[PDB]
């Protein structure tokens, strides 16, 4: 799609994570975990730059993943990805990058947004990190 190759690869990993954890749906949480674990990925350094502890974030995200029902993208994920698209359009980006997911997730309510807020993320410090 309009997604960067790195973002597409993280999505594939998110699917593997959901499968490996016996979850029926790939949730924004799965993608965040994949992005946090992506060597050379943009998400971890973006968070560190925004003043958010990426290490503790993956722990809280893993805790949330551990709470999901066990038994394929969820509508939650489709929704957040749609906002990523709109955000890329508003910022004038040619493609949808991983950093936008952090911003879109923060503005999409639900568990991931709650975790990000508690971790110190705000539309302001994430947007600043993105522009930087």
C-alpha positions as MATLAB code, in Angstrom:
seq = 'XXXXXXXXXXXXXXXXXXXXXXXXXXXXXXXXXXXXXXXXXXXXXXXXXXXXXXXXXXXXXXXXXXXXXXXXXXXXXXXXXXXXXXXXXXXXXXXXXXXXXXXXXXXXXXXXXXXXXXXXXXXXXXXXXXXX';
ca = [
       0.000    0.000    0.000;
       1.128    3.488    0.943;
       2.857    1.891    3.928;
       6.652    1.940    4.115;
       8.379   -1.417    3.759;
       9.393   -1.344    7.434;
       5.788   -0.719    8.476;
       4.577   -3.569    6.251;
       7.178   -5.918    7.748;
       6.116   -4.943   11.275;
       2.508   -5.710   10.346;
       3.549   -9.187    9.196;
       5.368   -9.633   12.524;
       2.270   -8.403   14.388;
       0.315  -11.198   12.706;
       2.937  -13.744   13.821;
       2.776  -12.379   17.356;
      -1.006  -12.721   17.456;
      -0.714  -16.302   16.180;
       2.068  -17.180   18.602;
       0.022  -15.849   21.514;
      -3.160  -17.663   20.414;
      -5.088  -14.431   19.855;
      -7.921  -14.428   17.331;
      -7.393  -10.828   16.224;
      -4.335   -8.720   15.470;
      -4.806   -5.673   17.723;
      -3.046   -2.314   17.786;
      -1.181   -3.814   20.773;
       0.356   -6.528   18.569;
       1.589   -3.971   16.044;
       3.021   -1.738   18.782;
       4.906   -4.703   20.215;
       6.250   -5.621   16.766;
       7.323   -2.012   16.152;
       9.019   -1.831   19.552;
      10.912   -5.043   18.744;
      11.932   -3.967   15.232;
      15.713   -3.675   15.010;
      16.497   -0.445   13.185;
      12.853    0.497   13.582;
      11.741    4.110   13.986;
       9.315    3.622   16.881;
      11.777    2.952   19.721;
      14.029    5.926   18.988;
      10.947    8.105   18.391;
       9.698    7.290   21.905;
      13.105    7.816   23.497;
      13.256   11.183   21.725;
       9.780   12.049   23.009;
      10.998   11.255   26.519;
       9.104    7.972   26.832;
      10.734    4.817   28.208;
      10.520    2.326   25.330;
      11.775   -0.480   27.549;
       8.972   -0.197   30.093;
       6.504    0.343   27.274;
       7.116   -3.101   25.771;
       6.624   -4.580   29.242;
       3.239   -2.896   29.710;
       2.254   -3.802   26.158;
       3.230   -7.418   26.772;
       1.162   -7.357   29.973;
      -1.836   -6.110   27.979;
      -1.276   -8.762   25.285;
      -1.247  -11.363   28.053;
      -4.764  -10.216   29.050;
      -6.337  -10.692   25.625;
      -8.746  -13.580   24.987;
      -7.132  -16.671   23.468;
      -8.408  -19.299   21.031;
      -7.220  -11.598   11.165;
      -6.797   -7.862   11.786;
      -9.282   -6.542   14.338;
     -11.498   -3.642   13.371;
      -9.571   -1.710   16.046;
      -6.424   -2.144   13.956;
      -8.169   -1.299   10.679;
      -9.457    1.861   12.357;
      -6.045    2.981   13.650;
      -4.434    2.207   10.292;
      -7.077    4.346    8.608;
      -6.088    7.239   10.882;
      -2.420    6.628   10.063;
      -3.391    7.172    6.435;
      -5.232   10.416    7.221;
      -2.340   11.656    9.384;
       0.181   10.932    6.629;
      -2.050   12.911    4.259;
      -2.315   15.849    6.655;
       1.441   15.970    7.275;
       2.074   15.693    3.554;
       4.044   12.438    3.766;
       4.469   10.360    0.596;
       4.156    7.117    2.556;
       2.752    6.000    5.890;
       5.606    5.406    8.316;
       5.850    3.601   11.658;
       6.089    6.839   13.663;
       2.587    7.840   12.577;
       1.189    4.692   14.184;
       2.264    5.968   17.614;
       0.374    9.217   17.042;
      -2.722    7.541   15.590;
      -2.835    4.944   18.383;
      -2.628    7.710   20.979;
      -5.742    9.283   19.437;
      -7.747    6.056   18.962;
      -8.822    5.257   22.543;
      -8.712    1.711   23.843;
      -5.992   -0.109   25.736;
      -2.987    1.002   23.694;
      -3.987    4.664   23.924;
      -4.352    4.277   27.706;
      -0.916    2.690   28.019;
       0.683    5.400   25.867;
      -0.969    8.186   27.865;
       0.132    6.636   31.162;
       3.634    6.294   29.710;
       3.730   10.051   29.099;
       2.854   10.236   25.415;
       0.840   13.230   24.210;
      -0.208   14.479   20.797;
       2.327   17.230   21.485;
       5.495   15.324   22.344;
       4.850   12.604   19.755;
       4.127   15.104   16.978;
       7.317   16.941   17.931;
       9.340   13.731   17.849;
       7.819   12.900   14.451;
       8.685   16.293   12.956;
      12.165   15.999   14.453;
];
